[PDB]
Design a protein around this ligand. Structure first.
Ligand SMILES: [Cl-]
Ligand SMILES: [Fe+2]
Ligand SMILES: [Mg+2]
Length: 236
């Protein structure tokens, strides 16, 4: 069986904390470490002649397989693009770079269910906050920023750690195979929401670093469309 098919089988077994989950997650990570662009029939892509249409998607998605337990697919970023900061509520995540370089910034929202965690009213922000914006801004933590190439191992996130991240293409196009479990499902309250860091105007700090996060629609210059998957087909 192809590698992508064995990834799907192991993912199905891994995602259905149950007994044996940590060992299964380890086996899945080992399989993803092995994945190469050619295993998916994808050739690495270089920058397009940048007289590019404004209707051209900055990012595209190849669907491979999705169940109630997990989703498996490939995101392909054009030059100079990014998948902006977003969350994966109650989800595990695991991705492997296929070509190019991406910068992955990892953050977490602090739990604010108990209330009263708005910024100090006297604190001011770069592009000042609208009243509705300030009412919604909540604290978070910037945990890491790192560059990943096809030689790097998988980048992994859990429901409770590194659950927010941004993925920027560095010095050219890039692509990664992504596994999410459970998949996004608005019907179950698992929305793919976007966030923007707001910078306070009060005259640096090492990571981990306190940040202020605001839920927002994705940036105007970002959207993702599907394109055909050319690799080995995955079956049940
Ligand atoms: Cl490009
Ligand atoms: Fe993500
Ligand atoms: Mg190679």
């Amino acid at each position: 069986a192809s590698l992508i098919q064995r990834i799907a089988r192991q993912a199905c077994l891994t995602f259905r904390p149950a007994p044996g989950f940590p060992e299964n997650l380890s086996l899945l990570k080992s399989l993803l470490t092995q994945v190469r662009a050619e295993d998916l029939n994808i050739a690495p892509r270089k920058a397009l002649p940048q007289p590019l249409p404004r209707n051209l998607p900055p990012v595209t998605y190849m669907h491979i397989y999705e169940t109630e337990g997990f989703s498996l697919g490939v995101f392909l970023l054009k030059s100079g693009t990014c998948i902006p900061l977003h969350d994966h509520p109650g989800m595990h995540g695991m991705l492997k770079v296929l070509y190019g370089t991406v910068r992955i910034s990892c953050m977490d929202k602090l739990d604010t269910g108990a209330g009263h965690r708005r910024p100090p009213p006297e604190q001011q922000f770069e592009p000042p906050l609208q009243p509705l914006e300030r009412e919604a801004v909540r604290p978070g933590v910037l945990r890491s920023r790192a560059e990943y190439t096809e030689a790097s191992g998988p980048c992994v996130l859990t429901p409770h750690r590194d659950n927010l991240h941004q993925i920027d293409a560095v010095d050219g196009p890039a692509a990664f195979l992504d596994i999410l479990a459970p998949p996004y499902d608005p019907e179950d309250g698992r929305d793919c929401h976007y966030y923007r860091v707001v910078e306070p105007i009060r005259p640096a700090c090492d990571l981990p670093r306190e940040v202020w996060l605001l839920e927002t629609p994705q940036a105007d210059d970002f959207w993702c469309e599907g394109e055909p998957y050319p690799g080995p087909k995955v079956l049940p």
